[PDB]
Every structure is written in structure tokens, then in C-alpha cells.
Amino acid sequence: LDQLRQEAEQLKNQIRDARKACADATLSQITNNIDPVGRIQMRTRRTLRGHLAKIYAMHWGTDSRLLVSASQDGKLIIWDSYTTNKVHAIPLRSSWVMTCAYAPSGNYVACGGLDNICSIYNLKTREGNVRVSRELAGHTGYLSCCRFLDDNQIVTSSGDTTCALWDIETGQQTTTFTGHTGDVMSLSLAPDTRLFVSGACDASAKLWDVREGMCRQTFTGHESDINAICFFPNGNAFATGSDDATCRLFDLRADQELMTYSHDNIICGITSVSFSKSGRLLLAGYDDFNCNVWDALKADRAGVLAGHDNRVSCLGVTDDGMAVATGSWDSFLKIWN
Amino acid sequence: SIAQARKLVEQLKMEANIDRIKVSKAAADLMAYCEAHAKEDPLLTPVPASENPFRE
Amino acid sequence: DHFLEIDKKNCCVFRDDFIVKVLPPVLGLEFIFGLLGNGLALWIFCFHLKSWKSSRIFLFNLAVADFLLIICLPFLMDNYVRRWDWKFGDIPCRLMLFMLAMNRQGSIIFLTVVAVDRYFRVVHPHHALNKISNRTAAIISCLLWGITIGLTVHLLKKKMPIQNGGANLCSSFSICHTFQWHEAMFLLEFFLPLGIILFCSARIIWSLRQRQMDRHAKIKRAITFIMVVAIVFVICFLPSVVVRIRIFWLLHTSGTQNCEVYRSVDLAFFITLSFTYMNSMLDPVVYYFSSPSF
Amino acid sequence: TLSAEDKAAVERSKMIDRNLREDGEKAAREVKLLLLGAGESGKSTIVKQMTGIVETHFTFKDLHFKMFDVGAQRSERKKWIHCFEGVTAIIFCVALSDYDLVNRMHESMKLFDSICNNKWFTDTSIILFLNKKDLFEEKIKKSPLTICYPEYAGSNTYEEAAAYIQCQFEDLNKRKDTKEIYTHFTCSTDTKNVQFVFDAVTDVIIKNNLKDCGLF
Amino acid sequence: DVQLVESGGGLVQPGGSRKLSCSASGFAFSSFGMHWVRQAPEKGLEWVAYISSGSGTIYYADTVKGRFTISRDDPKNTLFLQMTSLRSEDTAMYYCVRSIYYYGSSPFDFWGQGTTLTVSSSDIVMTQATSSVPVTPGESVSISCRSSKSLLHSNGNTYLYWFLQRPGQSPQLLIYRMSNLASGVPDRFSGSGSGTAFTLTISRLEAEDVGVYYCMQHLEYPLTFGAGTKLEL
Ligand SMILES: CC(C)(Cc1nc(-c2ccc(O)cn2)no1)C(=O)NC1=C(C(=O)O)CCCC1
């Protein structure tokens, strides 16, 4: 009622006051002395040309060589990036897939989409074929992002405005995170695999502690739908790319907006964002059919990745940081170095 | 009922009961980590093709 | 006069001033027009045709056939300069005839293939042939290319040039007496593709109007495009064949002993052979220049 | 230069590519239809003859139609509506009896405006089904059409009101040139509805073929 | 589970045209390359033939090239070996080893039960040096194996495997690519080395390690096995 509305009013007022008090000067003033990275060499080393339809998600294995890609033709394709060979081809029960994951151990993969079911496939079997290890259900909306914590614990983001930490051995939601008011369209796991950020459709991102489950911090400032989130390699920050043609950097300590990567030239939103191994370069896939890589410190366009006919949908960087890979809406993935 | 307002109040009050770190020093260790680990980042520094796995 | 029994055929060839009077300008215009038209055609098809579908593949092969065709013109142009003489030795004369033969064939075959593809895409929409891989289109096109090379290599294997009186000649369609597969295959590659073109066009028009699709403007313009393709094919490749059967008629009636009757008709025949190169410059215009895309 | 194991891996990759190509060829001949309604407009009634998304497969005249009923997807439509970009047609169903509902036809018009005038469906045709025609007759025999339609000048006649509703739903389209709207006063009747869809689908396919030939 | 049953044994008069069959039950047999490997009684293993998945690539040993035929029947999950013009040295145990080739795979992981065939009356040379070393439980011994050509490839992986033949049953895979330890095998077996010199230790060796240990090359066909090392006591 009215008094609860008023305490919420004063609580967010004092939160904003503390945020502004903890702000003295933008880090653009602290970073202008650093020599800019300049124009970045970018070439198409390999071109994975196996898909036959729209490509919606991808992920890099921890070996930095095998990558799994998901397309609307209902096929999960696991490629050896070094030789562009197709290690595996998995038929999906539901052809509508928008998320994909690769287990840290490499034994399992995850997939999901409009079926509201997260399917976990076992990659290493004595039968010599991939099989659907376990289907997880309980999400009332479409699955947008799923990430592996280990061989047995997964965390999934759905369109039901809630996230869920599951248990593949048993198949029930071990924990449920319900703090959002819109579709949660992305997910990122911190390096320690204890905290994770989720950017939803209410133009806000939220930080959750997977150990027990509750929204530790809420970050706002976006003017439209948030389509991608990605942790900083240090783990004390993250970057969110949204539909308003802006990428934004937040930290888990100051809990404030840091940088607004945007330009008057581009107006299309962001589909995927990922950092580099050192975190100096921040890549962002756009609807303008090209991926812009920005200096994470200078807020300047370090380079342009223009080799895709259609809109870039998924983007990933290998664990060793040796190369990046973009899967656009055309049937081709591309590897850049 | 208005239990959702109570949940929002708990969310906001817990978010208020946290320690906030000065933004300038956060950026300080941010770009400190950045320059410390920029040495072994092939994306930033063009790696020679001798040991580039994607040399093709 | 004439009846120089070129090989053993018992017969006559003529050279007249009207050739160098009328042919040079018209084939000069065809020359330049073909150069620029097929230039943009191949430029778009090589650097601006990322789609690269089966019909696009057939159109590109027609384009390359027409491009080689409009590059053969300068050598037969220079030949027309010196009143049916020849100067460039033996090897490139045979090269000119083989190029010109197998090209005009290639065009005809690819034009017919495009027509058949349109017929299947309209009349039989739910057919596998409508949606085929680019590999299948490439294989079929290469097979047709091999067909036209195989039908026409017979003249390549020859000391093509002929003393044309005191001068030289490389005309092969020198019109005399006996039956040969070349003029027979030339009449066949006009007649049978003519029937295929008309059957495909009639089926397309009848199916489109029977399904009441004639309302959307692009459909009407498609109807006009099919009509103009058929009409240009017939106006361009018909005069040559009707003249050809005219010499065949005058032959099986009179024979190759009184050649004064064929004094003019063969000249007329080379004017009609102009139209066969003349059609060339429509092939960019009516197929992939006035089309919705580019 | 590749070793024996690498050669065998390349052979396996080639076999996987062949299987992928075969599956793509098999799927490319299947017609996809996106079904949309209003929950009670009669999607079940349309699908009766043949927790997330629902897929229905049915064969007619050696043609395999796949219909994707989104149904209970209670999320942001614009977030996943681009997944269906490329379906052959959009079967939009609506009940004519809903003019005395909720106002419900106003919501149906709003949904039709959103779907038809969407950047993704700039070329996909919409097949509009108007069911409950008998219920429409029963309601119009007692309830005047002007209740939901203040700007209507006509009598309580089925044909006139039905034609007005069809015309007004049709003119909600903005790209009247590159996209067509097909309408059919469906009922229990017989497989006629399916026949209608087939015809419309064939139409779309024909146009698509003429688009591949660049001559459209 | 995975099961390979081999049949077509017995005694054949020399120069016959017999046949060997191998039925598979328990895995996707259509996507597995299959190897036929013989073993003369008091000798070491020797690779006879191999056929890839899809029957697109077939290889034979030089000793039996042109005399043996290999084929697959995927619908009924069977592997056929046509025997032609048999001679005395063809008398051997036979195995229907399976192998799947992709990045990180473990070829030669499972072995068939074996079938007897008794007939009346540029290759890499792989040497295992010592053939019989006496051991006691609780010890640790470094079995060594030597090759002529350097098995290390430009890729960076040494294509070499070692297997164990315990008394009275089929051989089993121990280590694949000289480093990666195969599934089911305990960590006690560990192998390493370099080109043309490969070693392994059985950390805390005990019983059920008795048998003959074979090192095998896989750089290119044909594949040559070692003489085998006999462990006793
Ligand atoms: C066309 C022809 C007869 C060359 C030729 N074509 C074939 C042939 C064979 C098989 C087949 O399927 C199709 N064609 N055989 O010979 C020839 O004399 N050419 C030149 C004229 C021209 O080409 O217009 C202009 C004047 C200079 C001479």
C-alpha cells in the first residue's frame, strides 16, 4: 500500500544518493593517458560452412578447440575449429533453439529454446553415439540462456522472468531466482562459479549468489531490452549489450554504471558481447551484420568485423583467448584471430 | 494482498545494507589487471604466425 | 563463276560490296553494346550475386556464352572489311568458327533451359526440380556445355581456311549441296527449342491466368517478360532458318550449277546471321537487367 | 599430408555433411505455417481436422504441412517472433462471434495490426480464418453489429456485416503490394478449409519461385 | 552393453574359400570403423584388414592383399571377411576390433572374443626389445617399446597405442596416443616418452596385470604391432 510504496521510494532514493556519493570522476579521465590499442588486425581464418539455416547460439569448450553451434534446422553441430571438421551432429527434438552450452569437462552439452525444456546430451558414451541424457522441465517460458556450472549443476535463464539452478542427476530445480519483471534474455557465469549476472527485458541486470539464491545487486541505466551479458575476466565487473545500440560496463563493488560504448553511426541493438582474455578488447555483435570490437578503457571502436551477410547472433572467445568466433543469422560461422 | 510490496521492500533494504567501493579505485585495479594481463593476449597484440593455431 | 567445289561439294560462294557497305556499322554497334551489357552482367554475377541460385547459375552461363559471342565479332568484322577475305592464318579462323558455332548453340540451350526452369517453377511449384542444389545446377550446366562442345568440335578439326578465289574464306555455312549435320543441327537447334519455348510460355501464361494471379503488378510484368522473351527469340533466330530452308529449296529444285539465283539470297542470309548476334544484346537486357533484382 | 586418423576424421566429417545435406533437402520440402489466434478464436477448431510450443504435422495432396501453434507462450512476442521469419504463411484465426465479447475483436484487430505490420513479416502472406459463422448469424439476428462498430451503416444482415468485417480487417495491412491476405469464412463443413490453405500455400510458393527466378 | 560375437572358425583344408562373420550388439555399429586383426598362436598380434564407416575406405595388410575381402552389413550389424586361397600361416585367432575416429576419440577401445582358424599342411618396424620380464606384486616396471620412424606428427600427437592381453580372453586397450588413458583402465598404468622411444610404468602393480603387453603404431597403414612383453609371477 501507500506506506510500502513510500519506503520503496526512499530506499531507491538513498541507493541513488549512495551511488552518486561513491562517484567522483569517470574512469575516462583516469584512462586517457594509456596508449590506445589502435586499429586491430582482423581476418577470417576459418569459415564453418555446415549449417543450413539461422544460427542462434554457440559456445567454446575449455580446450579452446571444440565449439558447439545451434541453428534453427534442429541440429547441434560440434566442430573441431582447428581443422573445421564436424566432430558431432545431434538431432534436436524441437527445431526452435535459442541457447547452447558446452560443459567444462566436455562430456555434456545443453540446448533449449521455445520448447521450455533444457535438454542435456551426453557426448562420451560407450555406444558411440550422442544421446539425450536428461530433459529438464519446469520453466513456463522459452529458454534464452543456459550455462554449465559443472557436470551435474546447470543454471538456466528462461522467458518466465525467473532463473533456475537445476541438478542434472535428479532433474528438479534445486534453486529458483525470481526477481525480474521481464524476459531474462542472457546469462553469464563468474570465473569462481559462485555468482552470476542475468540481464532481463526490464532494461536491468541482476546479480545472484548461486550458493543460496537471491538478487544481491541490481544494475539499471539501459533504455531498452537487454540482449547480452558477459562477465569481465577479473570477475569484478560485467558488460551488457542492449537493444538501444549501447553496451554498458558495471562493477560488482562500486555497483554503478562505468562506460557507455555507443556511437551516432550505429542505431541497431546488440545481440552478443564477450571480453578478451586480458579484458582490453570488448567484442559486440550487432544487427548491422558486423561485429564491433571496442577498447574496454577508451570507449573507442578498436576495429570492425564485417564478413557476415546477415545479422550477427552469437559471439564467443576461447578460454585461452587465441581467437574469437561469430555465428550470424546466415548459415555460416566465422573464426577470427 | 500486497506481499509483493513487502518482497520489494526486503529486496531494496538488503541492497541498501551493502558496502560500496569508491569507483575510481575500482577502475584503478580494473585497468591494472588489464595492463598486467595484456602481455599474453593474442587478440590485442598480433601473435606471430609461427605458433598461431589458425595460421591458415 | 564461283562453284569452287570448296571441299567436294559441288558448289558456289559470292562476295559483294553491299557486305562491306551494311555489315560493318551494324556489327560495330552490336560489338560495343555487347561489350558493355555483358560487362555489367558478368560484373554483377561475379561480385554482386551472393545468392547464386540455380536459375541464377543458368543465367550466368548464358551470360558467359553471350560474352564469348560478342567477343567473336571483331574477327568476322575484319573479315567483312575486305569483301570476304581472310588474313589471320589458319588456327584462329577455326577458333572463330568453333567459338561462333558452340556459342550460338550454348545460348540456345541455356535459353531453353531457363524457359523450362520457369515452366517448372510456375506450373509445377511442388516439384523437387524447382529446389535443387547449386551442385546439381552446375553439373547440368557443365553437361550441356560438354554437349555443345561435342556437337561442334567437328569443324575445329580442320584446316578451316579456304582459298576463296584469290582470297581466303572461313565461312563454313558456305551454301552448296550435300547434307551435313551442321546445317541440320542448326535448323534443329532453332526448331525444337522454339517448340519448347512456346510450350513452356503457353503453360506458364495459362496457369498464371487460371489461378487468378494476374492482379498483382509484378505478375503482369512477368507475363510481359515471358511474352517478350519468346517474341525476341522468334524474331531473332527465325530469319536465318527461313533463309536457310530457302537455299535448301532452291537447291533441291535447281541445284548448284546456276548460282546466279543464290547471288543475293546468301548475302541476305549473312544479314539474317547479323540478327543472331543482334539477339545477343537483349540477353542481358530482357533477362537480368530489367528484372526486379538489379 | 594428414595422418591416417586425420583422414578418417575427415571422412567422418564428410559423412556428417552428407547427412546434414540430406536432412536439409528433406526439410526444405516441408511447408511451415505459423498459427496465431486469441486463445479462444478457434485454433483448436481449425486444427481438429487434418507446455510450450505445439507442432502439428499433416499431409495433403502429397504435401507435408507443419503448423506451429505458439499457444500458451505468455512472454514478449517480439523477442521470439523473429524465429519464425521465413515461414510460408501465417494462419491468423478469429471468431466473428466475439463482437459481443469482452471488445475482443478490437484486441484481435490490434494483434493483426502488430503481426501484419512487422518488419519480419514483410513478405509472408497471411491466411485469415473467420470461424463461428453460425454463431455470428445467431448473434447478429438479435444483437446489432453497431455495438462493437459505431461507424457502420448497414442492416443486421450476415453477408453485409461479414463483408464489412473482412474489408476492415484486410485494410489493416500497410504493404498492400508485396504481401497478400487470403480470407475464408470457415465452418465445420468439410476439408474445404484445408483445401483453401493448400491453394493459398501454392500461391505463396509460386510467387517465391518467381522470386528465385528474379522475374517476379 | 557392447558385444562382439565372432564366428566362422574351425579347420579348413588349404586353399579354401571360407568366411568369417562378426555380429555387433550394443552400439551404433553404422558409425564405427572396424578392424580385423589376427594372432598366430605363439606369436604377437598382426593387423589384417580395416574398413571405415560407410565402407568408403578399405585397407588390407600386404601379406593378405588381394586374398582377403572385407565388407559391412549395417542394417543387420555384421562384419564379413571373405577368405580366399588359404595357406598354413593363416592359422590364427581372429578379432573384430572396433574403432571410431574423431578428435579426442579412443580407437581400438573394444575387442571381439576371437575365432580360431586352423589350416592343415616401408612399414614401421616396432620392437619391444625384452619379451619376458619377471615381476612381483607391489613393484613398478617401465615397459619400453621402440619404433623405426618417428611417430610424432606435425599435428603434435604421437599416434601410438598400447594394449594388454590377459591370459584367456581378448586384448583390451590400455593407452591411446601414448598419453591419454582409456576408459575403465585404472590410473596405475601411465605411459609417456618421445619419438621412437616409449615407456610406461604400472604404478603399484599387482595381480590381474599378468599377460602380454603390445605396443602398436597408427601413423599410417599398415599398422605393425610389437612382439609383446610377457609378465609372470
Ligand atoms: C555458323 C557456321 C556455319 C559455323 C558452324 N556452326 C556449326 C554448327 C554445328 C553443329 C551445331 O549444333 C551448330 N552449329 N557448324 O559450323 C559459320 O559458317 N559461321 C560464320 C557465320 C555465323 O556464324 O553467323 C558468319 C559468317 C562467317 C561464318
Coordinates of N, CA and C in Angstrom, one line a residue, chain A residues 21-86:
Chain A
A21 N 27.3 9.5 -4.3 CA 28.4 9.9 -3.4 C 29.6 9.1 -3.7
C22 N 29.5 7.8 -4.0 CA 30.6 7.0 -4.3 C 31.2 7.3 -5.7
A23 N 30.6 8.1 -6.5 CA 31.1 8.6 -7.8 C 31.7 9.9 -7.6
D24 N 33.0 10.0 -8.1 CA 33.7 11.3 -8.1 C 34.1 11.7 -9.5
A25 N 34.6 10.8 -10.4 CA 35.0 11.1 -11.7 C 35.0 9.9 -12.6
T26 N 34.6 10.1 -13.8 CA 34.6 8.9 -14.7 C 36.0 8.4 -15.0
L27 N 36.1 7.1 -15.2 CA 37.4 6.5 -15.5 C 37.9 6.8 -16.8
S28 N 37.1 7.5 -17.7 CA 37.6 8.0 -18.9 C 38.8 9.0 -18.6
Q29 N 38.6 9.8 -17.6 CA 39.7 10.7 -17.2 C 40.9 10.0 -16.6
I30 N 40.7 8.8 -16.0 CA 41.8 8.0 -15.5 C 42.5 7.2 -16.5
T31 N 41.9 6.9 -17.7 CA 42.4 6.0 -18.7 C 43.0 6.8 -19.9
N32 N 42.7 8.1 -20.1 CA 43.1 8.8 -21.3 C 44.6 8.8 -21.5
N33 N 45.4 8.6 -20.4 CA 46.9 8.6 -20.5 C 47.4 7.3 -21.2
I34 N 46.6 6.2 -21.0 CA 47.1 4.9 -21.6 C 47.0 5.0 -23.1
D35 N 48.1 4.4 -23.7 CA 48.2 4.5 -25.2 C 47.1 3.6 -25.8
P36 N 46.3 4.1 -26.7 CA 45.2 3.3 -27.3 C 45.7 2.2 -28.1
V37 N 44.9 1.1 -28.1 CA 45.3 -0.1 -28.8 C 45.4 0.1 -30.3
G38 N 44.7 1.1 -30.8 CA 44.7 1.4 -32.2 C 43.9 0.4 -33.1
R39 N 44.1 0.5 -34.4 CA 43.4 -0.4 -35.3 C 43.9 -1.8 -35.1
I40 N 42.9 -2.7 -35.1 CA 43.2 -4.1 -34.8 C 43.1 -5.0 -36.0
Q41 N 44.1 -5.8 -36.3 CA 44.1 -6.7 -37.4 C 43.1 -7.8 -37.1
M42 N 42.3 -8.1 -38.2 CA 41.1 -9.0 -38.0 C 40.9 -9.7 -39.4
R43 N 41.1 -11.0 -39.4 CA 40.9 -11.7 -40.7 C 40.1 -13.0 -40.4
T44 N 39.4 -13.5 -41.4 CA 38.6 -14.7 -41.4 C 39.6 -15.9 -41.5
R45 N 40.0 -16.5 -40.4 CA 40.9 -17.6 -40.5 C 40.2 -18.9 -41.1
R46 N 39.1 -19.2 -40.5 CA 38.3 -20.3 -41.0 C 36.8 -19.9 -41.1
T47 N 36.1 -20.7 -41.9 CA 34.7 -20.4 -42.2 C 33.9 -21.7 -42.1
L48 N 33.3 -22.0 -41.0 CA 32.5 -23.2 -40.8 C 31.2 -23.1 -41.6
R49 N 31.0 -24.0 -42.6 CA 30.0 -23.9 -43.6 C 29.2 -25.1 -43.7
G50 N 28.6 -25.5 -42.5 CA 27.8 -26.7 -42.5 C 26.4 -26.5 -42.2
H51 N 26.0 -25.4 -41.5 CA 24.6 -25.2 -41.2 C 23.8 -24.8 -42.4
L52 N 22.5 -25.0 -42.3 CA 21.6 -24.8 -43.5 C 20.5 -23.8 -43.1
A53 N 20.6 -23.1 -42.0 CA 19.5 -22.2 -41.6 C 20.1 -21.2 -40.6
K54 N 19.2 -20.5 -39.9 CA 19.5 -19.5 -39.0 C 20.3 -20.0 -37.8
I55 N 21.4 -19.4 -37.5 CA 22.3 -19.8 -36.3 C 22.0 -18.9 -35.2
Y56 N 21.7 -19.5 -34.0 CA 21.2 -18.7 -32.9 C 22.1 -18.7 -31.6
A57 N 23.0 -19.7 -31.5 CA 23.8 -19.7 -30.3 C 25.1 -20.6 -30.6
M58 N 26.1 -20.4 -29.7 CA 27.3 -21.1 -29.8 C 28.0 -21.0 -28.5
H59 N 29.0 -21.9 -28.3 CA 29.8 -21.9 -27.1 C 31.2 -22.5 -27.4
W60 N 32.2 -22.1 -26.6 CA 33.5 -22.7 -26.8 C 33.8 -23.6 -25.6
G61 N 34.3 -24.8 -26.0 CA 34.8 -25.7 -25.0 C 36.1 -25.2 -24.3
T62 N 36.3 -25.7 -23.1 CA 37.5 -25.2 -22.4 C 38.8 -25.6 -23.0
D63 N 38.8 -26.6 -23.9 CA 40.0 -26.9 -24.7 C 40.3 -25.9 -25.7
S64 N 39.5 -24.9 -26.0 CA 39.7 -23.8 -26.9 C 39.8 -24.3 -28.3
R65 N 39.3 -25.5 -28.6 CA 39.4 -26.1 -30.0 C 38.1 -26.6 -30.5
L66 N 37.3 -27.2 -29.6 CA 35.9 -27.7 -30.0 C 34.9 -26.6 -29.7
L67 N 34.0 -26.4 -30.6 CA 32.9 -25.4 -30.4 C 31.6 -26.0 -30.9
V68 N 30.5 -25.8 -30.1 CA 29.2 -26.3 -30.4 C 28.3 -25.1 -30.9
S69 N 27.6 -25.4 -32.0 CA 26.7 -24.3 -32.5 C 25.3 -24.9 -32.7
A70 N 24.3 -24.0 -32.5 CA 22.9 -24.3 -32.5 C 22.2 -23.5 -33.6
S71 N 21.4 -24.2 -34.5 CA 20.8 -23.5 -35.6 C 19.3 -23.9 -35.6
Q72 N 18.5 -23.2 -36.3 CA 17.0 -23.4 -36.3 C 16.7 -24.7 -37.1
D73 N 17.6 -25.3 -37.9 CA 17.3 -26.5 -38.6 C 17.3 -27.7 -37.6
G74 N 17.3 -27.5 -36.3 CA 17.2 -28.6 -35.4 C 18.5 -29.5 -35.4
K75 N 19.7 -28.9 -35.4 CA 20.9 -29.6 -35.5 C 21.9 -28.9 -34.6
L76 N 22.4 -29.6 -33.6 CA 23.5 -29.2 -32.8 C 24.8 -29.7 -33.4
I77 N 25.7 -28.8 -33.9 CA 26.9 -29.3 -34.6 C 28.1 -28.9 -33.7
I78 N 28.9 -29.9 -33.4 CA 30.1 -29.8 -32.6 C 31.3 -29.9 -33.6
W79 N 32.0 -28.8 -33.8 CA 33.1 -28.7 -34.7 C 34.4 -28.7 -34.0
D80 N 35.4 -29.3 -34.7 CA 36.8 -29.1 -34.4 C 37.3 -27.8 -35.2
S81 N 37.5 -26.7 -34.4 CA 37.8 -25.4 -35.1 C 39.1 -25.4 -35.8
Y82 N 40.1 -26.2 -35.4 CA 41.4 -26.1 -36.0 C 41.3 -26.7 -37.4
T83 N 40.6 -27.8 -37.6 CA 40.5 -28.4 -39.0 C 39.2 -28.2 -39.6
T84 N 38.2 -27.5 -39.0 CA 36.9 -27.2 -39.5 C 36.2 -28.6 -39.8
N85 N 36.5 -29.6 -39.0 CA 35.8 -30.9 -39.1 C 34.6 -30.9 -38.1
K86 N 33.6 -31.7 -38.5 CA 32.4 -31.8 -37.7 C 32.5 -33.0 -36.8

